[PDB]
Structure formats: structure tokens, C-alpha cells
Amino acid sequence: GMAPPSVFAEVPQAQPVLVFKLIADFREDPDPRKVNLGVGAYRTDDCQPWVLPVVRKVEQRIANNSSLNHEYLPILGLAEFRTCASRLALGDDSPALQEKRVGGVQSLGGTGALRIGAEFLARWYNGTNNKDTPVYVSSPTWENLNGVFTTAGFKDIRSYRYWDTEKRGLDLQGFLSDLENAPEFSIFVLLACAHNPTGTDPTPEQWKQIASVMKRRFLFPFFDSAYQGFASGNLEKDAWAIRYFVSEGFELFCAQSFSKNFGLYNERVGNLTVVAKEPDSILRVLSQMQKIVRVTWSNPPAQGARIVARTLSDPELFHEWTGNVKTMADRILSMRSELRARLEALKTPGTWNHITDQIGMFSFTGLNPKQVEYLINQKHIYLLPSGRINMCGLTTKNLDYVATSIHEAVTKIQ
Amino acid sequence: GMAPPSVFAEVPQAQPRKVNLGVGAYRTDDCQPWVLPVVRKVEQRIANNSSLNHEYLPILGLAEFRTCASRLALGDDSPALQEKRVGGVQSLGGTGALRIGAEFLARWYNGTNNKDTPVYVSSPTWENLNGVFTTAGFKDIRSYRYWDTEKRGLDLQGFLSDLENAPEFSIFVLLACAHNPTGTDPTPEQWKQIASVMKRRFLFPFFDSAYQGFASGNLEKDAWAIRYFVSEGFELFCAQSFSKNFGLYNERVGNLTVVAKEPDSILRVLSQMQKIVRVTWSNPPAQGARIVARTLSDPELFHEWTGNVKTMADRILSMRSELRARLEALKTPGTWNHITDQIGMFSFTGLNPKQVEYLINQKHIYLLPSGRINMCGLTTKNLDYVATSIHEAVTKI
């Protein structure tokens, strides 16, 4: 007479996600001095989200246009968006665009672009249905990257040396060694500019050395571009490495997000750019991408892509947008400069060059786990166990307290 | 030889008076798309609300959308809702809900990583269903009898026999109403017979509710089968789309409703769904879900929306009654009760593949080799031409 057990009775509870608990603990913390350096998105000097002025303007124009309908977009997405997105990454004068050997697939953010690209490679790259091609990611890398490629079926995910704990910067020699030892045709996922989570990017000359090994060993570049514009407010200058690989003759993928540089996080706007050697393969590659998309999300949403396409295709809106991006980049540069200056004025042990040598909103500070625990529990400054901070969590009002607390952690803990 | 070979060199090219009856979306009597009045109203309200930001939604989606969507499927006073044993995952349309549900089952249902559980779909069914379940890893996709070509209706005895012969715990994907592509639905009495076998043989119902409201013009009636299975104690999934009943095709608004025996199972299931979503689309878009949540949460807007849905369903009913009457007035061979017995946007005309070619080649009327037409492609202006061209097709080829 007993009720049968649920068909879900043996489904385990998934492991807790650290950063969600961190944000939860931050919000309940009563202390008026508390600071959230674990936030994952842009914030103003008043600790607020920022809807870009150009985005509000385009949203109003869309709302006032009654002729726009809601009929399905093409499987591959809105044509003007795909063209504009690939042109943003590659440059108007890209030889690959001139030679008609570029494809673009609209995707559900950068995540969706990585996922479709991984699914394609696991079916059609380095053989048919080859799940064994090594996929290399940086140590450390974006937190969801391993899961995307594992879910696409890749059985051999590897790391390359990248963050050097002692030097607080790039381990160039370790990275180059790991490239030299990678099996021919291995896939390397390369974060393009503003490395998340460390902030450490190769310089252009270091990128040339990386590219040289990849060219020689036939290693496939899969760029992940989520912060174009955050290094300088100059969208062209910030894409230098992707463009250098194109001009060196590489075929490559580039997963693009518009979540951060348009602030369109919750409209899920991305694009997968494909650069091929010959124009005829783009049609074939895209036909397979269509089949992958069809069984994942069918076709992509319109609102965010419409905003991006309208902005990138109109000179006036494009100029306003580049100014909005520069506002974000400049605030981050300011917080980096101000934090470093204060840490040095307090004569904090260690070197702090990395605070301004790093690029973008995320910084590996070099603080150890015990020091992170001190900052959270004693000073109410919330950050990840890795020592990652978001520079947008710093403000004119909290900078002295944050710098003083870091000085305490460095001198009194460990 | 000259250059390094392309890494894409071996990628295959994937396989591929006038009236258009091949459309798959609602169209007006003037052959135009229709943004629903309630949707325009809510869009203007959203555009006027400057407090809305663009920060990421939760992985599982906007909470009020998930609650309102599951309530639409299950009913506001569903015992499963009052007992707190329902979960909802916002998804990228109905397709995304089906995919997330398939990924979950292929990992956690009927064992761990059991890719061998049979997955049954109707003959015929929605053309993308096989691809969704195959991509999730299922190796054994089967069909159950459904369309009876001779009777032009449901082959109940074949369906029941295929249920009886299905291995215990097999998954059945059940189109909940307004069957795509046949327009043939089980009656409530037939649904009860289907449920009885599934209960006895532990068969898992995976409902697909993409046309709630189009079957009858009434959202409550069209969800009856889902709610009946809930009342019979089933655990189940229901993949919901808002593409058709809100006309929000290109905003990709769906929800996966999960019904379990108890609340703790919902918590564990949702925790695994979060992992699946995170590596597929990260978190879902806001615009379409905000429109649906705003509409369903406001009794005034809900009422207006149900009126908009009934306008669409009534125009379809008009086209069905007209086409059958005009065909029967022309003394067309065969019975044509199925044109009005069928339900939803589509009709399996019962027209053989070689009468299709005539309609396309000789009379410029476009439809699928299966004989499916979208009733939203018929208008007051083309009805007499289509009914005459079908008359000729049947009396001639």
C-alpha cells in the first residue's frame, strides 16, 4: 500500500555554487562598511547597474516602430546583427571579410557561441565525431568554460600555464612549453582581451610568440571575446590579437558576447564568428551550425540583436556607444590607478604593478585564501577565494577602507 | 600542393493565383503577421518603465514568469501547486524546454546516464522532435501509431497497442493539444485510456504544449489532458511555448514545467537543471518573459489576452467550416468531416503525395508532401480558389 518512490528519488542535489552564497552573505551583512568585490558585472561609482544611454535610446526607437513584427528570425539569426558583429571583431578592412570567408551565427550570449562552436568541433573537426581532440584552457580560465566543452562531448580537457602566482603576471615560458607539447590539431581556447578572471593579458609581442607555436603545430584558436572595448574604450585597438591571427592566415572561431560592452546581460546577445581558408567552406560550416542551433534553441531572440545591429550600423549611434564604452573603461582604469596608489602609500608588502598592468574589470590580487577569509569575516569585504576582485566594486567612497583592509590582511594574516 | 589544408575541407553541406498553405505561424485574413494587442500594450508599459535594468536573470529564469507559466499549464488551484511539488525552468521557446528536459532525462532518469531508455513519438509528429532527443544522447527513438490514413483520424487501437508493448519506463512525448502536424487530438475518453496504460507500465509523460488555446479557443480546456495526468498521480514534464499563443515567436519564450511526487525532488531536479542551463545559454532573455509575466499576473491583461487568443482560434474555425462546406458543396469525393474535426492551426488534408504536386504545379497552391496545410493560410479571398483546386485534385489525380 506504500506510495512508490519518485522517479526522481535518486537525483542528487547539485553541489552549492560558491559565488551565489557569497552574494547572499554580502546582502544580509549589517555592517555599513561592507563592500561587494565579487559582483560579476559593471557597476557605477554609486554601486549601481548602468543601462547604457545608447541602449535606452535605441530601445525607445524600437518601441516607437510599430512595423516591427515578432515572426521567427532565421535559424542563424538577424543578418544585419551577424554582419555587424563579425565586422566589430575583425575590422572593416579584414582580409577575411574582403575574401568572403567569414561566417557569423547569432547565439545566446557568449555562452551560446562557445557551446555551438564546441558542438560543431566535436562533430566535424579533426575527423568525424572526434571527442578525443585535446581542448586546452588557461590556468585559471572563465568559470564555465570546462563545463561547456565537456557537455559538447570533449573527453580530454587540459590546462596551459598562464597565471604566475609568484610574479603576479603571465607565465609566458610555461604557456609556450604547454603549446609546444600540445598534440597537433589541439584546440586552444584563448580569452581575447581583459582575461576573466585574472586581468592578465599577453602583450602584442607575447601574442606573436603564442601564434608562432600554434601556426607551427596546427593548433586551432578558439577565441572568447567578451570585453572588446574594456581595455581602452577603443574597440579597434582592443581586438588586436584576433586580427593578428587572421592576418597570419589562421582559421579560427571567435565567440563574441555583447553582455558587457552593451550592458545587455539579460538579453543574451552573442555571435560566433568563423574564419575559414576558402569562401566555399563557410556555406558548408553554416549549414551544420544550422542543424546544431535547430535542436538547441531553434532560432535566436530578436530584442538584444536588434539593439546591437541598430547601434553598430548607424554612425551617430555607434559614436555614442563608443563613448559609453569609454566611460566604463575609464572608470575601471581610475579604480585600478587609485587602488594601486593607496596600497603603495600604505607601503604594503609585495609588488602592486599588477593592479595597473592587468586589464578590464577583473583582477587576481595575489591575496591567499586565508587573507580572503580575513577580508570577508573581519572587514566585510567580499571576494572570491582565488583573490579575484571586480574593480567596479571599488568607489571613491570605499577606496581608503578597501586599501587599508588589504594592507591589514597582507601584514597580519599568513 | 601549396597551402595548409583547411580544417573545414571535409565538412558536408547539410541536407536541404498563388497561395501559401505552408506557413507555420498565425496570419490574418489579409495574409499578415499579427502582433497581439495585449502584447503591444505591455511592450509600451515596459518601454516606459525606466527602473528596469539589464542585469542577468537567475539561471532558471524570471521567477514570476516561471510561476505564471506553470499555473497556466496546471491550473491556479492545481493540487500539485498547492502541495509545492512543481518546478518551472524558463527556456528558449518550446524547443529549449524540450532540449533541457531531454538532457535531464538522459542523465538522471531510469538510471544514471541511461541513453537506452526508449523515447516514443507519434507517427507523424513535430519534425524537430527526433533531432532534439537524438542530440541529448538517446539511441532508441521509436514511433507510436497515431494518424490513420484511411479513417483520417486517430488510430486509437494502434496507439494503445504500442503503449502496451513499450518497455516499462519508456518516455512518451505527447503533444498536449492541437497536434502538429495532423490536427487530430485524443478525446478525453481516449486520453483516459492512454493514461491507464501509461500508469500501469510506468511510462513517463513528456507533454509538449505549444498550442494551448488554439485547439478550442479556451486555455483551460486545452490543458485538460496535462491536468488529468496530474490528477491521476503522474510525475511528468510539460514543455511550454509562448511563441504561438502570445505571437512572441522571435522572443524565444518557453517554460519547462516539472511535476514530482514531493517538494524535495523538485529542489534536486531544479539543481541539475541549473547545471544544464548554465552550459547551454547561461540564463534566459528577459523581454518576452517580462511580457508574458506582466500579462498573466494582471487579471485585466489576462482577460484581454484570452480574447486575442480566441480571435485567432475563431478565424481558424471559420476557415475550417468554410473549406469543408465549399468542398462538400462541390460534391468532392471522400468524406471531409476531418477538416472540422481537426483542431489547431494545421490540417492533414488526407491528400496523397501525388495530388500535392498538382496543387503546386498546376494551381500554384503550396503545401507539404505530407498534405499538411496551415489554416491560417486560407482567407475569405482565396477560399473558393483553394476549394475548387482541391476538388480538381481529387476528381482528376
UniProtKB/Swiss-Prot annotation, chain B:
Record-linked NCBIfam families: PRK09257.1
Gene Ontology process terms (BP): 2-oxoglutarate metabolic process; aspartate biosynthetic process; aspartate catabolic process; aspartate metabolic process; cellular response to insulin stimulus; fatty acid homeostasis; gluconeogenesis; glutamate catabolic process to aspartate
Annotated catalysed reactions: L-aspartate + 2-oxoglutarate = oxaloacetate + L-glutamate; L-cysteine + 2-oxoglutarate = 2-oxo-3-sulfanylpropanoate + L-glutamate; (2S)-2-aminobutanoate + 2-oxoglutarate = 2-oxobutanoate + L-glutamate; 3-sulfino-L-alanine + 2-oxoglutarate = 3-sulfinopyruvate + L-glutamate
The keyword Protein biosynthesis is assigned to this record: no
Cofactor: pyridoxal 5'-phosphate
Database matches in PROSITE patterns: AA_TRANSFER_CLASS_1
Pfam families: Aminotran_1_2
Binding-site residues for L-aspartate, renumbered to this chain: G24, W126, N180, R372
InterPro entries attached to this UniProt entry: Aminotransferase_I/II_large, Asp_trans, NHTrfase_class1_PyrdxlP-BS, PyrdxlP-dep_Trfase, PyrdxlP-dep_Trfase_major, PyrdxlP-dep_Trfase_small
Lineage top rank: taxon: Eukaryota
Protein name: Aspartate aminotransferase, cytoplasmic
Complexes and interactors: Homodimer.
SUPFAM superfamilies: PLP-dependent transferases (SSF53383)
EC number: 2.6.1.1, 2.6.1.3
Protein family per UniProt: Belongs to the class-I pyridoxal-phosphate-dependent aminotransferase family.
Coiled-coil residue windows: none
Residue numbers of N6-(pyridoxal phosphate)lysine PTMs: K244
